[PDB]
Amino acid sequence: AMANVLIVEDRFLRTALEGDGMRVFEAETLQRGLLEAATRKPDLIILALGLPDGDGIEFIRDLRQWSAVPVIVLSARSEESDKIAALDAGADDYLSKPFGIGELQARLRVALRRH
Amino acid sequence: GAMANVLIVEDEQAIRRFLRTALEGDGMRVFEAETLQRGLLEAATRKPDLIILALGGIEFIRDLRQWSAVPVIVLSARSEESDKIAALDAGADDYLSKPFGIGELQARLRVALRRH
């Protein structure tokens, strides 16, 4: 009944998502994130890139070798080329700051229903 | 105690690490090779119980089969029926296409390892 969300990083977000009736798990490296995503099968991956960087794109490609779980990317800065890169790599959505928790949550719901 | 030996032929570091962690977690010893040639060399010196061949190949299989009956499982980005048929006919024992499920790969490894 409750949706399993894995956050792959690099506290308020986890709190708000749990407030929206989700179980939240956190992975604090991309290596750990890959291992956990492929092995533990959460319902959704939130990839928090912080500053837009290439190691995020390789991560998405690596994950897509091993799983079809929906991935939503969050980043601090809006760079169009990185959104295009990430989405083509297999990601399902991408929000850059500034964004609202309301919109994020709405986008999570879209991703879950289409799966 | 008891432990099977798996040789992984894979060029990507991230996947090589992932697979090491997952296979060692299932009680396997893991050897790795970053190219096909080194893979053949590792197949000769390590006498592995099993080889996971991460493609992008047929020639590697054909060469190996002239001196070794070790089980080979292919992981490929290609899902082309033609490619699967070619690898298996060349001597591969199994073939998975992306996205591989780690749980299924592990079950398929268990199948290859049951000897008689």
Curated annotation (Swiss-Prot), chain B:
Question: 4-aspartylphosphate modification sites?
Answer: 54
Where in the numbering of this chain does the Response regulatory domain appear? Answer: 5-113
Write down the superkingdom of origin: Bacteria
Q: What is this protein called?
A: KDP operon transcriptional regulatory protein KdpE
Q: Where located?
A: Cytoplasm
PTMs per UniProt? Phosphorylated by KdpD.
Its annotated function is as follows: Member of the two-component regulatory system KdpD/KdpE involved in the regulation of the kdp operon.
